[PDB]
Structures are given as structure tokens and as C-alpha cells.
């Protein structure tokens, strides 16, 4: 596999960040790739057996490092807003152009001019319609996650304390509450659909959970509002007979 | 100097339809290119769909097929019968087979394979917050796959894209879109007015 | 057009920190990569107009061999190489004719490690103008060959030697040539 | 200089029989002149030649895509590099320059490529049997060969001595007389 870390990071312009990657394929060659805001993939670095072999005119702000051919790290000395991106780690058997690249899950970096723009989601669950129940014998719960920035959230549904995937549809991307502003807070919706009789059991519990990735314990916070740290925000409903 | 051009944007196809994803490359300074299709399935990382490393051959995987045609400088991606599980982002890529591995990626093509809704029952329902009855959302659901949900043109009205959920114990698929607003004059009756929805859409009275 | 052998031969030598990379076709060098200039050097200039080679990949290979050499040196309890002295032969590429241009060839064969000092001695004095040499060429027994060339004009009053220094030789080896 | 030397060698060999029809690939690793690991395309995996290569053979064969890549090298590496340089290596033809000068009859064949060459002496019409000494094929190191083939036979009257040279660069035998 190809493991990289962190999965999400948000930081202010001028700060330093370090990403780490490991591959267990036994491969000699490893790669950093940048996936920019508009989802364009471009190589940044290639390392072969601890030696840097390609540097695709990457700003000196970027410092890759490899003391072992299974490991490849990326330090960005003093991030600028254009560095906001997904950084993909990859490995290949060796540096030959014929080789398959095996990619990691990616590190979503968000570089912000002002950490005061960071907000956790507000989460609300909307109970199924009486009309939907009597019309379809089904019951759709809707979860709204709203007002968050950056868009580093993972939404999940939990029925009676257990994560479900059946019956669930979450928007592939958040929408901007104010499309005009490039610093716009986001909104996300998800649906959980169950049989009406399952929703009508008051012994059943439905929770919408939004994992938000924000600041860490290290980050200093001047504002009077709560520090928008990495946190889970949930909203819940119990089944209703009538 | 080296670029890869592929089908721009999103391609929406019904399941069982045939698919073509175009890919041509411009590699004036590469003697013998290698051509790749990488796929990113939703919530996953990039992985190889298929590659061809010999200028005449064709590669195949997962029912997809691509032919390295150096004559027309193309690597089009084809599948006779796409399934819902093919929904993904597809990346055409080029490497120089004689130097260090450097993938030149196309912009990527998002494929959305739409299932057929066997018994549509299109409806718009108003759902209330479990916490505050005064807060509501509008749920448009059970419409056929032909129906396109239009994004909001108003910044104070929010409409999500169409979403397909699969209740797998019931073996029941359904489309839905959600609309909500803080405007006082916002009602579910007019929430999806900028969309062409079935004439038989159920609008229950509150 | 029937039976051929193409060999990509690489080596790295500690502690001299000298590595080389070359392609061999049927005992002839197609090209080598000059590690210093990071350029592909075709044995015949004409080759470079019919084929190409990105020399950077040769440097990446040499890096890997340097790293593996340290590893292999530890696996052998630091077993060193045993020097093998070379058999050297001086000859000409054309029949010799007075006042007719010719080239002297010094063929240093069957030696290891790939380190030699070669000096052409005209009348016992070193001559350098117009000299040329090949890189170390691989052998099937995994020793090395090397060619040194000296263009000259044959005369009765000019005597030539090929001075070869190798760590396998107890004394430098001269190979004579006169007319 | 006194300190000991340590030599690593890697040879990626491509053996061609009847052009690119039968190709064998050998990935050979050496410590000094000792081969310790080898991938043989006829075997399909790395194998240790000595104990020194046991960890490499086991490690490499376990690498993701390694066996697939090496098993494909006869096509992606050998056949490819064969065709890349074919027009100036396999097809290279430089005709020999022949000179016949005296000694108790020296046919000097210089500057030819490839090295497959046949030279045969003819004394007034019939090919001479004995007295034919050959210096052997010698490689000049510049994609040219040379060879000297002499004849130990007495000149009679006006006997015509002909050196016939047969070379793949020539459609017909090259004959030089003395």
C-alpha cells in the first residue's frame, strides 16, 4: 500500500507544513504529485532510492526528503495560498516510464490568509415527511452541514450507534453559501432513507455525524468564538410513532 | 510542450449504454510514449485502470478498452456497457518510455452512470428540523433519471445536485435533491421551479 | 542481421568514486554517459543523429550501484577486489607507409579494477597532442578492455611506446613500436 | 595508492538469435567479477548465483510488479533497443580496404564491419591449401575490424596471387592480385 499523512491540514500563509508518505510495495521510486484546485494533476518530485531524480520546477519553498526508499516526505517551508491543493504520494517499481504508479489517498492542504475564516459545521437533521411516509412507506432523513470552512468534512450516518452505508446519499461536493466570495463557507447535505416502519419505531436512533478537520491544539486563537479545531459535530433524531 | 487532452468535464450516461472517453496526446519531444488510464473511484485514491506500453497494442480492464493509436495520436477509452460501479473520475496520462517516469495527465473526466428508476413516484416533500420546527428543507425525490435538477440561480436559495441512494436490503434505488433557504417567501412549491420536473410530481399540502 | 548481443554495462568503484555507464553491441561501444558533463557520448558522432538517450537515467543507475556497492561490501565482510594486471598490445589500424597518415592503438585487455594510467611515449618522451581513448569496455569474464589511440606520421627516426600503469603490475609496462 | 578497491557491476544483456525472433534477457549483478544475482528470461525470476545474492533474489521477486516487468524486458527493453539502433548497428556495413604486399603475400584487410569475413588465397587459379597463416579477427574499438592473412609460398614465374575477400558488405567477392 501507499500510506500518506496527514489527510487534511489547514494553516495560515507563511507557516510550515510537513507531509509524510510510506509505501510497502518494495518499490525503488516514489513521487509527489500536486492536484490543484481545478483538479489538474502535475508531477512535482520523483525520488529514486533516496536520490531526487526529477524536480518539475517546484518552488524552493518545497523540500522533499527520503532517508529510505520506502519513505518520502514533503516539507513546505512557508506556504502561500497557491499551495492549497491535494498532494498525492505515489510509488513505482523503478524510474522507468513503463511502470505503473501506485497512489496514496492524498493530503488535502488548505492555505488561508486568515485563520479567522475557519468555521466548523453547524449540523441539523430534518425528520421524514408525514406525506412521504404515507405516500411511499419510506422515510427520508436529511442532514444539513452548513457554515463550514474550509471544505474538510466527512459526513456519516449512524443508526442505533452503528454507521450505515445502505440508504445513504451524500452530496459529492459542498456548495458555497455565498458563491461570490472565494472565502465562502460551505454547506453539505446528505440523505438517509429507511422504511417508514423503521422510522416509526421510537426505539430507533438516527444520528448525522460530520467530522470536521480544522485547527489543532497547537494553533493560537485570538477570537472570542471557540477555536475551530478538528471536531465532530452531530445532529440526531429518534424515531416517531406519531 | 507535452499535453494530454481528454473529454472535458462530466459525462452522464445511463447504465448499459456504451461509453467513449476521448483522449489525444501531443508529445512532439517523445520518441515512444506510453499511455495510461487511471481511475479514481468515489472516496478512493488514484489507481491504474489500464495501460498500453506498445504503440500498436490495446489494453483492457474492467470491461474498458483503449487502443494506443500512434497514427492518430490517441488513446480513447471505450466500454460497451457501463455499470453504475463505473462512476468515477478517469484520467488519461502519458509518459516518456525512455526517460524517468513523469505522467502528463489530462484534465480528467468525471463519469456519472445513472441507474434506471423502474417505478418513479416524483414528489416534493417538506422536512422539518428535529430540533426547531421553524427550520425546513425541501426534498425532491423518486423522480426518473431523465430529470435534471438545476442548480440555484439565487445565492439565498440552495439546491444540491441529484443524488442516488441505494436501500440495499429493499433493493430500491431513488434519486433525490434537497433545497433550502432562509428567504421568507421560499416554499417547497416553488423551490425547484427552475428545473423541469415531471408533470405528475406530488406536491402535498401542509 | 542474425545473432547479436546488446549489453548495458555499469560499474561503480570505491573508494575512487568513479562510475561508468555504456551500451555494448557485439563488443563495440554504442555510447557511454559522461558522468561529469551528464551527457550521452556516442562512440561514433553519426550515431547521435539516428538515436538518442536520456543520460540522466544513467546517472540514476550509477547512484543505485554506488549505494548497492556499499551494501555488497558489507555483505562480503569488506572483501576487496584482487588486482588483475593487463595484457597490453600496440598495433596500427592501417598498413604502415612512410609519410602516410596512420594511428597507433594501445589495447589494454583483461584487467581489473578499471583504473589505468596510459601515456604514449614518443622517443621516450610523453606525447599528448591528438591522443584519444575509450571508456572501460566490459568483457565476458567481467574484466575490462580499453583502447588508446595516437594518430601520427610514421618516420624512421620516431620510436613509440605505450606506458601502462596498473596496480596489478609490479612495475609499469611498456609496449614498444618502431619501423 | 595503497587502499583496497571495491567494484560493483551491473550488466543487462540482450541476446538475439535471428534478430528479434528469439531474444533472451539477462539482468546480471556483480561484486568484483563475481555474479551474485541474475534474472534469466528463460527462468522468469531472479535467482542467486552465489550466497551473496540470496537476499536480493528473494527481496526483488517479492516486489510489486517486478516479475511482470522483468518477464516483459525481452520486448520492452531488448527488442526495443535492437530496433532503435538497428539501422546503424545490425545493418551497419563498411566495406574492407584490401592491400597485398610482400613477405616470404600479406593480405591486409582493414576497416570493415561487421567482423564476419572470409579471405582465401588463390595461386594462379586454385585456392592455396598450406602456408596460410591468419592473424585473426582484431577489433579496432571504433566499429571497424582489421585482419592480416599471409601466405607462405614461393613466387614462381609470373604466377598471379589473388586474395579473395568475402564480406557481408559486398554482394560479390573482392579480389586483389599481386
Amino acid at each position: 500500500a501507499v500510506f500518506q499523512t496527514p489527510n487534511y491540514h489547514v494553516t495560515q500563509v507563511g507557516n510550515e507544513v510537513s507531509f509524510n508518505c510510506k509505501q510497502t510495495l518494495g518499490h525503488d521510486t516514489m513521487y509527489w504529485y500536486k492536484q490543484d484546485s481545478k483538479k489538474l494533476l502535475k508531477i512535482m518530485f520523483s525520488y529514486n532510492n533516496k536520490q531526487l531524480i526529477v524536480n518539475e520546477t517546484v518552488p524552493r519553498r518545497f523540500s522533499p526528503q527520503s532517508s529510505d526508499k520506502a519513505h518520502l516526505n514533503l516539507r513546505i517551508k512557508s506556504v502561500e495560498p497557491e499551495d492549497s491543493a491535494v498532494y498525492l504520494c505515489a510509488s513505482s517499481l523503478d524510474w522507468g516510464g513503463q511502470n505503473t504508479l501506485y497512489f496514496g489517498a492524498g493530503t488535502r492542504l488548505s492555505v488561508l490568509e486568515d485563520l479567522n475564516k475557519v468555521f466548523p459545521p453547524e449540523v441539523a437533521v430534518f425528520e421524514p415527511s408525514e406525506a412521504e411516509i404515507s405516500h411511499t412507506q419510506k422515510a427520508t432523513l436529511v442532514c444539513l452541514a452548513t457554515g463550514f470552512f474550509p471544505d474538510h468534512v466527512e459526513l456519516s450516518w449512524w443508526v442505533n450507534g452503528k454507521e450505515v452505508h445502505s440508504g445513504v446519499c451524500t452530496d459529492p461536493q459542498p456548495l458555497k453559501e455565498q458563491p461570490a466570495l472565494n472565502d465562502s463557507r460551505y454547506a453539505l447535505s446528505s440523505r438517509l432513507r429507511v422504511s417508514a416502519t423503521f422510522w416509526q419505531n421510537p426505539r430507533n436512533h438516527f444520528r448525522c455525524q460530520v467530522q470536521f478537520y480544522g485547527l489543532s491544539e497547537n494553533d493560537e486563537w485570538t477570537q472570542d468564538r471557540a477555536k475551530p479545531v478538528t471536531q465532530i459535530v452531530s445532529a440526531e433524531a429518534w424515531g416517531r410513532a406519531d | 510542450g507535452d499535453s494530454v487532452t481528454q473529454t472535458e468535464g462530466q459525462v452522464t450516461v445511463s447504465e448499459s449504454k456504451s461509453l467513449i472517453i476521448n483522449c489525444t496526446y501531443s508529445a512532439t519531444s517523445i520518441a515512444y510514449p506510453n499511455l495510461f488510464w487511471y481511475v479514481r473511484y468515489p472516496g478512493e485514491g488514484l489507481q491504474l485502470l489500464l495501460k498500453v506500453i506498445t504503440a500498436g497494442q490495446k489494453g483492457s480492464s474492467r470491461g474498458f478498452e483503449a487502443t494506443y493509436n500512434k497514427e492518430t495520436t490517441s488513446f480513447h477509452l471505450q466500454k460497451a456497457s457501463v455499470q453504475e460501479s463505473d462512476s468515477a473520475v478517469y484520467y488519461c496520462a502519458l509518459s516518456d518510455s525512455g526517460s524517468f517516469n513523469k505522467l502528463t495527465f489530462g484534465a480528467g473526466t468525471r463519469l456519472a452512470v445513472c441507474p434506471y428508476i423502474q417505478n418513479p413516484d416524483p414528489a416534493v416533500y417538506q422536512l422539518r428540523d428535529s430540533k426547531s420546527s421553524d427550520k425546513s428543507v425541501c426534498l425532491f425525490t423518486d423522480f426518473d433519471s431523465q430529470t435534471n435538477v438545476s442548480q440555484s440561480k439565487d445565492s439565498d436559495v440552495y439546491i444540491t445536485d441529484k443524488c442516488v441512494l441505494d436501500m440495499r436490503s429493499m433493493d430500491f434505488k431513488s434519486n433525490s435533491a434537497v433545497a433550502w433557504s432562509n428567504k421568507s417567501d421560499f416554499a417547497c412549491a416553488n423551490a425547484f421551479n427552475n428545473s423541469i420536473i415531471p408533470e405528475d410530481t406530488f406536491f402535498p399540502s401542509p | 542481421k542474425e545473432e547479436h548481443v546488446i549489453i548495458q554495462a555499469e560499474f561503480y568503484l570505491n573508494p575512487d568514486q568513479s562510475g561508468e555507464f555504456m551500451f555494448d553491441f557485439d563488443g563495440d561501444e554504442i555510447f557511454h554517459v559522461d558522468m561529469a558533463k551528464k551527457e550521452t557520448v556516442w562512440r561514433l558522432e553519426e550515431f547521435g543523429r539516428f538515436a538518442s538517450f536520456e543520460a540522466q537515467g544513467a546517472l540514476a543507475n550509477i547512484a543505485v550501484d554506488k549505494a548497492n556497492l556499499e551494501i555488497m561490501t558489507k555483505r562480503s565482510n569488506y572483501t576487496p577486489i584482487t588486482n588483475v594486471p593487463p595484457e597490453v598490445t600496440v598495433l596500427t589500424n592501417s598498413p604502415v607507409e612512410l609519410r602516410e597518415p596512420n594511428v597507433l592503438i594501445c589495447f589494454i585487455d583483461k584487467f581489473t579494477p578499471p583504473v589505468v594510467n596510459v601515456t604514449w611515449l614518443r622517443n621516450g618522451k610523453p606525447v599528448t597532442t591528438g591522443v584519444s581513448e575509450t571508456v572501460f569496455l566490459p568483457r565476458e569474464d567481467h574484466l575490462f578492455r580499453k583502447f588508446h589511440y595516437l594518430p601520427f606520421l610514421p618516420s624512421t627516426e620516431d620510436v613509440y611506446d605505450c606506458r601502462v600503469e596498473h596496480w596489478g603490475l609490479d612495475e609499469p609496462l611498456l609496449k614498444h613500436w618502431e619501423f | 595508492d595503497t587502499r583496497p578497491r571495491f567494484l560493483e557491476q551491473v550488466k543487462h544483456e540482450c541476446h538475439f538469435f535471428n534478430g528479434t525472433e528469439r531474444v533472451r534477457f539477462l539482468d546480471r549483478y556483480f561484486y568484483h567479477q563475481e555474479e551474485y544475482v541474475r534474472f534469466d528470461s528463460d527462468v522468469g525470476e531472479y535467482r542467486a548465483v552465489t550466497e551473496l545474492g540470496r537476499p536480493d533474489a528473494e527481496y526483488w521477486n517479492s516486489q510489486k510488479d517486478l516479475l511482470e516487468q522483468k518477464r516483459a524486458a525481452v520486448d520492452t527493453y531488448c527488442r526495443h533497443n535492437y530496433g532503435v539502433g538497428e539501422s546503424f548497428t545490425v545493418q551497419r556495413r563498411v566495406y574492407p580496404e584490401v592491400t597485398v604486399y610482400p613477405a616470404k603475400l600479406v593480405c591486409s584487410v582493414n576497416g570493415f564491419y561487421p567482423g564476419s569475413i572470409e579471405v582465401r588465397w588463390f595461386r594462379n587459379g586454385q585456392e592455396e591449401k598450406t602456408g596460410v597463416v591468419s592473424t585473426g579477427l582484431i577489433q579496432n574499438g571504433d566499429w571497424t575490424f582489421q585482419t592480416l592473412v599471409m601466405l607462405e609460398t614461393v613466387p614462381r614465374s609470373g604466377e598471379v596471387y589473388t586474395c579473395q575477400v568475402e564480406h557481408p558488405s559486398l554482394t560479390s567477392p573482392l579480389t586483389v592480385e599481386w
Binding site: - | - | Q8, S52, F53, N61 | D56, T76, N81, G83, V84
Partner: peptide, 13 residues
């Protein structure tokens, strides 16, 4: 045409 170097493999460690 471009020659393809066979890449040197990193020894086990």
C-alpha cells in the same frame, strides 16, 4: 529513436 535504460535495482537491506 530513444534507447531505454534498464533501471538498476536497489539491493535488499
Amino acid at each position: 529513436g530513444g534507447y531505454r535504460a534498464r533501471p538498476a535495482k536497489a539491493a535488499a537491506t
